[PDB]
Amino acid sequence: GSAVPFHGAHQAGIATPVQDRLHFAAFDVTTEDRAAFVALLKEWTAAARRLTAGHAVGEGAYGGLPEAPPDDTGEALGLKPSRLTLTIGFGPSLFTRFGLADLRPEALADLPKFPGDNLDRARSGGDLCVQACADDPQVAVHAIRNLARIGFGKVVVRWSQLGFGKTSSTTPQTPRNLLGFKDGTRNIAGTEKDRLDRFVWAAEKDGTPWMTGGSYLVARRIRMHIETWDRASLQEQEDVFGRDKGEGAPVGKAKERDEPFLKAMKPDAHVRLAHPDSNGGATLLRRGYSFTDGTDGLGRLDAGLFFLAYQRDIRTGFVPVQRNLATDALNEFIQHVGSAVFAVPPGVRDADDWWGSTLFG
Amino acid sequence: GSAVPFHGAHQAGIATPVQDRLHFAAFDVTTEDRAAFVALLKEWTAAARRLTAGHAVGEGAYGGLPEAPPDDTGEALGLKPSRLTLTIGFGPSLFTRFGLADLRPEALADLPKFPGDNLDRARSGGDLCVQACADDPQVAVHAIRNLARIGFGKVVVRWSQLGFGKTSSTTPDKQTPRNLLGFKDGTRNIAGTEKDRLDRFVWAAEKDGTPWMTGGSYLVARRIRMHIETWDRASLQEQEDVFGRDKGEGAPVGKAKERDEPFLKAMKPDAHVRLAHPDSNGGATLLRRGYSFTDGTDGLGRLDAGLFFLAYQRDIRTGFVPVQRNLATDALNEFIQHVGSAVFAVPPGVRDADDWWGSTLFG
Numbered sequence A: 001g002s003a004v005p006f007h008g009a010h011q012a013g014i015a016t017p018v019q020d021r022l023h024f025a026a027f028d029v030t031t032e033d034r035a036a037f038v039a040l041l042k043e044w045t046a047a048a049r050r051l052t053a054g055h056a057v058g059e060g061a062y063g064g065l066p067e068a069p070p071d072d073t074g075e076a077l078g079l080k081p082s083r084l085t086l087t088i089g090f091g092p093s094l095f096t097r098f099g100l101a102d103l104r105p106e107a108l109a110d111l112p113k114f115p116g117d118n119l120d121r122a123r124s125g126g127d128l129c130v131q132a133c134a135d136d137p138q139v140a141v142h143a144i145r146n147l148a149r150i151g152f153g154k155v156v157v158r159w160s161q162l163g164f165g166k167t168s169s170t171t172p173q174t175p176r177n178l179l180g181f182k183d184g185t186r187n188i189a190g191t192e193k194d195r196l197d198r199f200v201w202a203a204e205k206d207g208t209p210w211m212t213g214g215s216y217l218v219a220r221r222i223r224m225h226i227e228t229w230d231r232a233s234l235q236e237q238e239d240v241f242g243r244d245k246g247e248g249a250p251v252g253k254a255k256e257r258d259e260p261f262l263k264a265m266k267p268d269a270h271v272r273l274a275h276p277d278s279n280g281g282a283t284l285l286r287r288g289y290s291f292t293d294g295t296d297g298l299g300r301l302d303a304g305l306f307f308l309a310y311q312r313d314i315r316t317g318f319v320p321v322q323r324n325l326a327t328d329a330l331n332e333f334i335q336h337v338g339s340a341v342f343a344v345p346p347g348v349r350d351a352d353d354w355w356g357s358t359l360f361g
Numbered sequence B: 001g002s003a004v005p006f007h008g009a010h011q012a013g014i015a016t017p018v019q020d021r022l023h024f025a026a027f028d029v030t031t032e033d034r035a036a037f038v039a040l041l042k043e044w045t046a047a048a049r050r051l052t053a054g055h056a057v058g059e060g061a062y063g064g065l066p067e068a069p070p071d072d073t074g075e076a077l078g079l080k081p082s083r084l085t086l087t088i089g090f091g092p093s094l095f096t097r098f099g100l101a102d103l104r105p106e107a108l109a110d111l112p113k114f115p116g117d118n119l120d121r122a123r124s125g126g127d128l129c130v131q132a133c134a135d136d137p138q139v140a141v142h143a144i145r146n147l148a149r150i151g152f153g154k155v156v157v158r159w160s161q162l163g164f165g166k167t168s169s170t171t172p173d174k175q176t177p178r179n180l181l182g183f184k185d186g187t188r189n190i191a192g193t194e195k196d197r198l199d200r201f202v203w204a205a206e207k208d209g210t211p212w213m214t215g216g217s218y219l220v221a222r223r224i225r226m227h228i229e230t231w232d233r234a235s236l237q238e239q240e241d242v243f244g245r246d247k248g249e250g251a252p253v254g255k256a257k258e259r260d261e262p263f264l265k266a267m268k269p270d271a272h273v274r275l276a277h278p279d280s281n282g283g284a285t286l287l288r289r290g291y292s293f294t295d296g297t298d299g300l301g302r303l304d305a306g307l308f309f310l311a312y313q314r315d316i317r318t319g320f321v322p323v324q325r326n327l328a329t330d331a332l333n334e335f336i337q338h339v340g341s342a343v344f345a346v347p348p349g350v351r352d353a354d355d356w357w358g359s360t361l362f363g
């Protein structure tokens, strides 16, 4: 049973190895009391220490007083830690509370409206987020379900998204997204300490001292028009990305990890427009997950990519790259239907520290 | 990661060990051409052979004519079979088509209305279903997607349900999974090794009155929402009283081990296990094979959570119906609500490479 250390200078779940499953939940805060919210962050941190070690929260899921509800709802009993990481983030709307308005980082910028946005307000925004990643989806769901229960009366669940990537028990190998293309070939790796400092981690010179060691998260629920995509020819699909579908190699190259020659790609191929060379060097840490929630009323597959990007500054990461996708040939086949941004605070340093301690003090 | 044999006297995915993930899809038929629908069954069967072996459908996911869409959508490239099983069923409404009226099995009975039902007609019923079970969700989605794509113009997806984790067991030698109420679910089920119990309670026999159905089974699907807010503020004793088993071990009340036999008189008269036990239902026994689901939030600040209940039986009238009628006074009813329902006749297995889904009905 593998576990990921909860404590560190950075929150786990960003540069740590990508787990198979995701349960992402945005919460809205319903209390105005700063002291009550800080108390909740401490209880949540205590619970997160237990959950990421594979233990039940509080006094356990059974064996307590019969007249009392158990502290843990119990559906993770007998399961492994499953590399569970719990990553918290603070939304822009949180800073309108608790007198925090002047502590919102400038790097936590509102996203502009992008062409083709069809954002569902109910699946967007949120005062805070908890990203729960694990190899077992029931471990992730158990974590979110119990954090929400502990927070009841102080927070509510605004929206939640289940996601999946590869299945590590059977898969060695770049995963493929639901379009059939390898996804993640040219990404910041967790082993690239220098590129993380340059592009992912907030530094104290960036202007917000309490965010040092943290990062900024952009979440985009991107629906795929599956049935339209599946009717396109193989050449159209490969032209859209600039990589072949079988190997994932850039056009004109042989291997997946051959560095691309952007001029051989069509001008509005996804890779050519998203590449850092096309965006003044802007580089992103993509950590998204595929989703399939079912089928809509027309019988179409409600599926897509729950896109998650971590970066040092939203204005120099997601925004320029996404702006450059305005003519992306991929736009024919996708629609952004949900969006949120979060400031992901630094890590919990030790057993006495707590989520958001550098912001709330 | 290994493959589950596709051929057999029975369809796989019933007595098969329960895989981690579920993608259940109900289809409606849009063609009146019996020959066109038979051709779709053969085309689906050939696809299933490829999918359950871990191979792309048709000519493959790439390498073909650049100007044509690939035969396989390709998102399962490089993945193992992952114990994928594909189980097809026929809904009662199918038999209004293709001159099949007199071939409806009597064991494929319409369920009566049960107290507490709030069935959404959009996520209920269906001419046919495909149950895709696999350990890898992408493998299960890939199978359903390519089957639906192959069936474009002849079938449409009516509704689908994804199960993120199993709440059932056909392998008592393995650890029993827990449902979202935190209890072990599947302790006293029918095991895939229990050939005598499967013949008695699961597989239809020729003497049951419908010859084409011999070796098949009958499927009841019930989408059940859980009131987890109400459940999570119940005391431990209340929760254990609801079921008649303790929460930690899952042992019957008063007993020490999960698989000790229940002593029914020690549970509350409205305990779920006491009411659902075969001894309480004239011996009626089910093969439960359900999965948990969560489809976001309920719009009221809470996680949506539920159980997609799947039951296989020799005859719906002698399996699910008497058991569900006896759960009218179930203490669990305070915490659940049936919101979707569908029954299907699950035809016999594909015998070999020449055979095809539904061949005994059509053929």
Ligand code: HEM
Residues within 6 Å of the ligand: A177, A179, A181, A182, A183, A184, A185, A186, A187, A220, A222, A223, A224, A241, A243, A260, A270, A271, A274, A275, A276, A284, A304, A305, A307, A318, A321, A322, A325, A334
């Ligand atoms: C459903 C939506 C999307 C799909 C299916 C998709 C798919 C892909 C694929 C197949 C690649 C090439 C393989 C790789 O290097 O990972 C790629 C690259 C990339 N994509 Fe996307 N993408 C989507 C949305 C986005 C969005 C919204 C952004 C940013 C705003 C983005 C940014 C990038 C970047 C930075 C790369 C790396 C390019 C490089 O450095 O070579 N993608 N994507």
Ligand code: HEM
Residues within 6 Å of the ligand: B179, B181, B183, B184, B185, B186, B187, B188, B189, B222, B224, B226, B243, B245, B262, B272, B273, B276, B277, B278, B286, B307, B309, B320, B323, B324, B327, B336
């Ligand atoms: C959300 C819905 C349900 C939940 C959470 C649930 C939970 C449980 C639990 C915890 C057990 C004890 C462990 C076991 O033997 O599996 C059990 C047993 C059982 N349940 Fe349910 N159940 C649900 C719905 C149903 C329904 C609708 C039926 C039938 C119509 C049913 C039939 C049975 C049967 C036959 C047993 C085995 C009893 C025995 O032979 O000892 N369950 N269930």
